């Protein structure tokens, strides 16, 4: 992955990642987001409705938690997950867990890590993990890692120390297995930075993982409720300061527009796009401006004030829902528990979110991210 930075202003990396994909003729602009999927599908959106959205990222995120239970099927299919799900044109980064429904913690050992899907728990060693990636054949895939040192419970320093060594042992094992596979050599392994909330282990994880020939870095354990805490924000900057500038930085569990801008200032490139999915799942539509439970970035369309509101969700929006339907129609679909609401809302919430990331790159070119950041936070 040949990464090229246009400029770095206030710590924000503006650029593009070239020479990507099976043909090597793909580019990913940074900072950006990945298309969020569940079981190889964007939620509520078929391949047909997905084409109705403007600015869909060229790289999509898959989760082992939603696909590991389909290992035998994709193995017999042989042709990779992208062609299996009818999306062979997109790039695919396979992460370990799903950000919204990850499953219960406490199943990480030095010998195996577990994920959870619709059928149940799937326990996978490093061998089984690489066998599943050999069947999925993703462009990028997160390496097997120990991210459970970062939890709400009072974590021990030895536990944070273990997550660094355990993830490194997983990393060196996956590199030996990848070098012994013709198919997996085409994929790009992503190192995972761990260490919990211990600064020393966070710094050691960043330095030791960077010493491996990984193609990128996953910043794990910085997810925060309701957002990234100031302690982990400072923790994040200390980690990115130890990472090479020539490789992409990915973060998981960080998708709300306010934390996105905070992490871009810390040098994070790629983000998950599960926040517009959460907004859709509660019958809400993003309405926050970027020109020049429920948050204030959105409106609740189950509210009775939208019974006769015949305006679009966002005036001027070019999405399918806002150019063809009204809030009254969306409110009606939600009251009658119709699945078109989830479709029409997801189309707008994805288009609004993808357009929000366009404003980040547009503002970085104009050196006006501070104004855009001020406009985002003023709506809270």
């Amino acid at each position: 992955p040949k990464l090229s930075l246009i400029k770095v202003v206030n710590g924000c990396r503006l650029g593009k990642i070239q020479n990507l994909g099976k043909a090597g003729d793909c580019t990913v602009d940074i900072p950006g987001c990945l298309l969020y999927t569940r079981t190889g599908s964007a939620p509520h959106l078929t391949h047909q409705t997905l084409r109705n959205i403007h600015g869909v990222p060229g790289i999509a995120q898959l989760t082992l938690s939603s696909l590991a239970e389909h290992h035998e099927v994709l193995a017999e299919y042989k042709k990779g997950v992208g062609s299996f799900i009818g999306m062979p044109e997109s790039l695919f980064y396979c992460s370990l867990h799903d950000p919204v429904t990850p499953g219960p913690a406490g199943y990480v050992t030095s010998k195996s890590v577990s994920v959870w899907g619709f059928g149940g728990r799937v326990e996978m060693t490093v061998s089984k993990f690489m066998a599943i990636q050999e069947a999925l054949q993703p462009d990028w895939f997160q390496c097997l890692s120990d991210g459970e040192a970062s939890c709400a419970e009072t974590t021990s320093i030895k536990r944070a120390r273990k997550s660094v060594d355990r993830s490194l042992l997983f990393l060196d094992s996956c590199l030996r297995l990848q070098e012994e596979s013709e198919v997996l050599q085409k994929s790009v392994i992503i190192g995972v930075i761990e260490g919990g909330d211990v600064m020393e282990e966070r710094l050691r994880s960043a330095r030791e993982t960077a010493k491996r020939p990984v193609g990128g870095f996953l910043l794990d354990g910085f997810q925060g409720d309701p957002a990234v805490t100031e302690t982990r924000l400072h923790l994040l900057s200390s980690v990115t300061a130890e990472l090479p500038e020539d490789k992409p930085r990915l973060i998981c569990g960080v998708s709300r527009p306010d934390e996105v801008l905070e992490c871009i200032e810390r040098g994070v490139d790629l983000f998950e796009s599960f926040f517009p999915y959460q907004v859709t799942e509660r019958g809400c539509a993003l309405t926050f401006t970027f020109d020049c439970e429920m948050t204030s970035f959105e409106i609740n369309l189950k509210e009775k004030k939208y019974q006769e509101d015949f305006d679009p969700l966002v005036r001027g929006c070019s999405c399918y829902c806002c150019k063809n339907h009204t809030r009254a129609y969306i409110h009606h679909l939600l009251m009658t528990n119709e699945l078109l609401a989830g479709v029409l809302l997801m189309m707008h919430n994805f288009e609004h979110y993808f357009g929000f990331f366009c404003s980040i790159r547009e503002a970085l070119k104009n050196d006006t991210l501070a104004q855009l950041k001020e406009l985002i936070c003023r709506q809270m």
Partner: protein, 383 residues
């Protein structure tokens, strides 16, 4: 009165008809299956998808819209056309079919006591006027085909009187087309009376009601044949509540032009995909590694893009898109079947088409349903 239907081709053997309907929101080729649009949106199918499938007319449930969001909001939303943003044609029912029927109309009681709502023939025409559909249905007195006795005749004569009351209340025949509903149950005499009485009214179309309600299939197709034998040849015949593939092929042979059924939209929720050999139960594990499409000859987005194995994976997940994929295909199967029926009529090969459809569906002709063999034989189609 201006005819809304022109016959393009007829089967010299049977009663099959190929034609097109001239309606305010475009022309519709016949025979035509009409999907229940209120369920398609509930299935997550947008207007653009349903239009892409070639559907030029769909149904709307008047009673459903009477509960949410009501006729007042639909009128303010530029009719039902503008409310759901449907550019093509719409057919709404009278909304009368928990309910008591008197001469005044159909009575709906409020839950846990409360005032009643009276849906009279005049009220029904007024409600359907606000929806702005291109075809409106008469308010009829509906009794189930399983019932016998004096209520059948009582409901038939009341359906005729209500037809006259709907015609008087319908003050815009230039914008909406009112259809009569043949009742009379499974009684040949009462139905003949309803056929003789209702065909004297100047309505642009006629519908065959009171059927497909658990009765024997022998009593079913014979009541269809009695209806088509006495209905105007130059006006469309609408058979309500029929959507099974064999039933459509047989009833086209008997002279029906329009059909509706919630069948294609519902079995998609059960994991079943319609195919020329019947249906595929894609949720069953035999399709877990079937890397072929549902039907390679189907033009729908699902079959042009996805495999049975992938749809099987989605059915074993929380993806609501699994229902979206099957609803799209099942509607496409209905439209493809009816357009193939229509091409056979235009090309004067409808019997050969029926023989091939029955052979592919059931195999040897001795395995075909006995009622369908008799019904097709009554119009000169032998297997």
């Amino acid at each position: 009165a201006p005819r809304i239907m022109r016959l393009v081709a007829e089967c010299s053997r049977s009663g099959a008809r190929a034609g097109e309907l001239r309606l305010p929101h475009g022309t519709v080729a016949t025979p035509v299956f009409m999907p229940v649009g209120t369920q398609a949106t509930m299935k997550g199918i947008t207007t653009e998808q349903l239009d892409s499938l070639g559907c030029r007319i769909c149904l709307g449930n008047t009673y459903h819209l009477g509960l949410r969001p009501g006729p007042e909001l639909i009128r303010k939303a530029q009719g039902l056309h503008g409310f759901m943003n449907w550019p093509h044609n719409l057919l709404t029912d009278s909304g009368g079919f928990l309910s008591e029927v008197t001469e005044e109309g159909v009575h709906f009681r409020s839950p846990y006591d409360g005032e009643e709502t009276l849906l009279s023939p005049e009220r029904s025409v007024e409600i359907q006027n606000a929806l702005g559909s291109d075809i409106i249905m008469q308010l009829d007195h509906v009794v189930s085909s399983t019932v016998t006795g004096p209520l059948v005749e009582e409901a038939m004569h009341r359906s005729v009187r209500w037809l006259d009351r709907c015609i008087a209340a319908h003050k815009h025949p230039d914008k909406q087309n009112l259809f009569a509903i043949i009742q009379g149950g499974l009684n040949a005499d009462l139905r003949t009376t309803c056929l003789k009485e209702m065909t004297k009214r100047d309505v642009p179309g006629f519908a065959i009601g009171g059927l497909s309600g658990g009765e024997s299939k022998a009593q079913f197709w014979k009541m269809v044949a009695l209806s088509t034998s006495m209905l105007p040849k130059d006006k469309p015949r609408y058979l309500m509540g029929v959507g099974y593939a064999t039933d459509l092929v047989v009833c086209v042979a008997l002279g029906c032009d329009m059909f509706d059924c919630v069948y294609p939209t519902r079995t998609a929720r059960f994991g079943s995909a319609l195919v020329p050999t019947g249906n595929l139960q894609l949720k069953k594990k035999q399709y877990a590694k079937d890397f072929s499409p549902i039907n390679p000859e189907c033009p729908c987005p699902t079959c042009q893009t996805h495999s049975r194995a992938f749809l099987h994976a989605l059915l074993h997940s929380d993806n609501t898109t699994a229902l979206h994929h099957l609803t799209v295909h099942n509607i496409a199967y209905q439209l493809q079947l009816l357009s193939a029926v229509r091409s056979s009529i235009l090309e004067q090969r409808f019997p050969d088409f029926v023989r091939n459809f029955m052979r592919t569906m059931y195999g040897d002709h001795s395995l075909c349903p006995a009622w369908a063999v008799e019904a097709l034989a009554s119009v000169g189609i032998m297997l």
